[PDB]
Amino acid sequence: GLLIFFLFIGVILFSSAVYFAEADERDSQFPSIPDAFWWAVVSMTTVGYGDMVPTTIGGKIVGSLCAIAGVLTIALPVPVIVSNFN
Amino acid sequence: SERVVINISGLRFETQLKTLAQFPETLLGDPKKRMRYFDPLRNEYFFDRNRPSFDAILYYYQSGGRLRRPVNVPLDIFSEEIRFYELGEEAMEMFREDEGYIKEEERPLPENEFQRQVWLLFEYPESSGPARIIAIVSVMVILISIVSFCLETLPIFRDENEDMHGGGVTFHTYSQSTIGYQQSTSFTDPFFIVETLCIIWFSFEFLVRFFACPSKAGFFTNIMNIIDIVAIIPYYVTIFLTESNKSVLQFQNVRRVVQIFRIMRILRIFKLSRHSKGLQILGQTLKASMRELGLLIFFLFIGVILFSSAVYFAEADERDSQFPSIPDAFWWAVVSMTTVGYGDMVPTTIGGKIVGSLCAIAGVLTIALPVPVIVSNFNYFYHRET
Amino acid sequence: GLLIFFLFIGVILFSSAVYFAEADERDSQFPSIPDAFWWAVVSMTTVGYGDMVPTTIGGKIVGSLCAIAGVLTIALPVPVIVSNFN
Amino acid sequence: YFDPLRNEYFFDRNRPSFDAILYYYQSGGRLRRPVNVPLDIFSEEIRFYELGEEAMEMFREDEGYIKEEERPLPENEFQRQVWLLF
Amino acid sequence: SERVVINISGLRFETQLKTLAQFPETLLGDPKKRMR
Ligand SMILES: [Cs+]
Ligand SMILES: [Cs+]
Ligand SMILES: [Cs+]
Ligand SMILES: [Cs+]
């Protein structure tokens, strides 16, 4: 559950920031904050399909932090789960 | 039930004489052997030795066989004690098994004089300067046979043919495609040359090994020898097939097979496992991780089907659905689960994207499970090198 | 070194198989075996750029195994390195 | 087990285990297995000193183990007969 | 082989004098040093 919750907190944060950082664009790939949820989950789990990508310096900065925070978030609850498994 | 007192550097131990008498061939069980350590003034046997070890030695008599090393006692010390108290080899062996160790083999070429002489240059690089040169030369040949096999596909070398622009697919132009090189006792083709020099060497190694072989009994048992054989089977089987089918219409009837054996040449990369410890370690790791490795594929399978199904239905009522059928979505599911996510297939509907999120997360967890074990088995074999 | 070596062994294997499995195609994204090296390293490290992707059932089967073998290969030498670090 | 010459009880048994057996009396119930003593050995001692099943059970719980169930088809003759193939 | 008894806060240790004499410069190996 903590895994889903943390992912949730991250999605909203990064979806919001990316949205605003790409807002003043005629070709913004992020129509709304809820639209950016897909991109955020995709880059956090790092599955990164590339079907939505920031284009502005700001968006790309937000994206970098989203990529890094994603890797750490997942890496936390897993070790335990993995244990219970063994 | 006469009692017996054993004093180990001041630490007092007592037991019954019948307890020690249980093992007549040991030091404490032999009256003539312990006699030397008896102190008639204190009515006890005294040994100026290691204290932590003795609880275990004594328990070995009391338990009737159990010889465990105390958790807090180094293995080098405890084995020295086992020897001193002369518990015997049968017990030390079983002790060493439970402690981890266990193994031993070899045996140079039985007599032979010359057999056992050659079998030291193609089997033991750790013997002489020359024998170590063979390894160097053998590796080169392998790396080369690999680079060769690879260039044979480079269009820069195969687009320089008779029908490069599309105008008359010749027979010896068609068979050179299916093979990668032009076979001919004229040795015109550079590739057919190198590929031939390499098979000569690989054919040499195999024969030499098979003759200077000590136990030709289990030669085709050693997985390493199986590789040496498969590394050359394509070459000769191809010749056989191109000669048995020397006409356009017949070679076309056996082209499939020919192609298969061309693919089988890649297995020559595994010929490096003879000069690579790590490659050998990995092999052992895989043989030891059969169940987890399988569980990994099974779990991935269960996940693929589930997520392929859900994504399919969630993207079904779409004119531009990237998922034609459930089996088509298998690719997407494996791609997103292993998280390699190529993006060549992506959901577009809220539902599909929800399914995709769960597929991404479930993928990360699934993989992360069996790995830890595999990784372990690896470290076990990797470190248990010395 | 073992990390680079194992990656090397994997690249060649999967580059070869993918090549042949996508050979009889007019739109094969794999011109030669050496060309497929890029795809193999890209999918094994799982960075998977999607700039080269198999299209035939066979190619996709090879790709699945390449993705899985990649994840395991990397995961081996790392633990040690990570240790030396700590 | 009494030795009238030395006014003591003598047991030709395992040494590391006894601290625990004795402490069980002193503490009034606590039966812990010494960290350095194998579980197979310690349980044999628990049985020898006849600490009783109520204590062994609680000991085994804290040690990890715990479980047990089943029961074939009650009579049935044929019920309990089929319930062995499915 | 004169024996030597060493008492460490009540824990009893015994060894042979030649065992300690093996290292003459240590406390237990020096008669003048352990005397105390
Ligand atoms: Cs990716
Ligand atoms: Cs991508
Ligand atoms: Cs990872
Ligand atoms: Cs990834």
Author numbering:
A (entry chain B), C (entry chain B): 325 to 410
B (entry chain B): 32 to 417
D (entry chain B): 68 to 153
E (entry chain B): 32 to 67
What do the authors of the reporting publication say about this deposited model?
Here, we have used x-ray crystallography to determine the structure of a complex between CTX and the paddle chimera, a mutant of the Kv1.2 K+ channel from rat brain, with particular focus on the influence of toxin on the selectivity filter structure and distribution of ions in the pore. Charybdotoxin (CTX), a pore-blocking toxin for K+ channels, is a 37-residue peptide isolated from the venom of the scorpion Leiurus quinquestriatus. The architecture of the paddle chimera channel typifies the family of eukaryotic Kv channels such as Shaker, with four pore domains together forming the ion-conduction pathway through the membrane and four voltage sensor domains surrounding the pore. Scorpion toxins have evolved to fit like a lock and key into the pore entryway of potassium channels, and disrupt ion conduction through presentation of a lysine amino group that competes with potassium in the selectivity filter.
A CTX complex with the paddle chimera channel in the presence of Cs+ shows that toxin is bound but that Cs+ adopts its expected distribution (i.e., similar to its distribution in KcsA in the absence of toxin) with an ion at S1. It is difficult to tell where in the electron density map the amino group of Lys27 resides, but it is clear that Cs+ competes effectively for site S1, despite the presence of CTX. The mechanism of competition put forth above predicts that CTX should not bind with high affinity in the presence of Cs+. As shown, this prediction holds: CTX inhibits with a nearly 10-fold reduced affinity in the presence of Cs+ compared to K+.
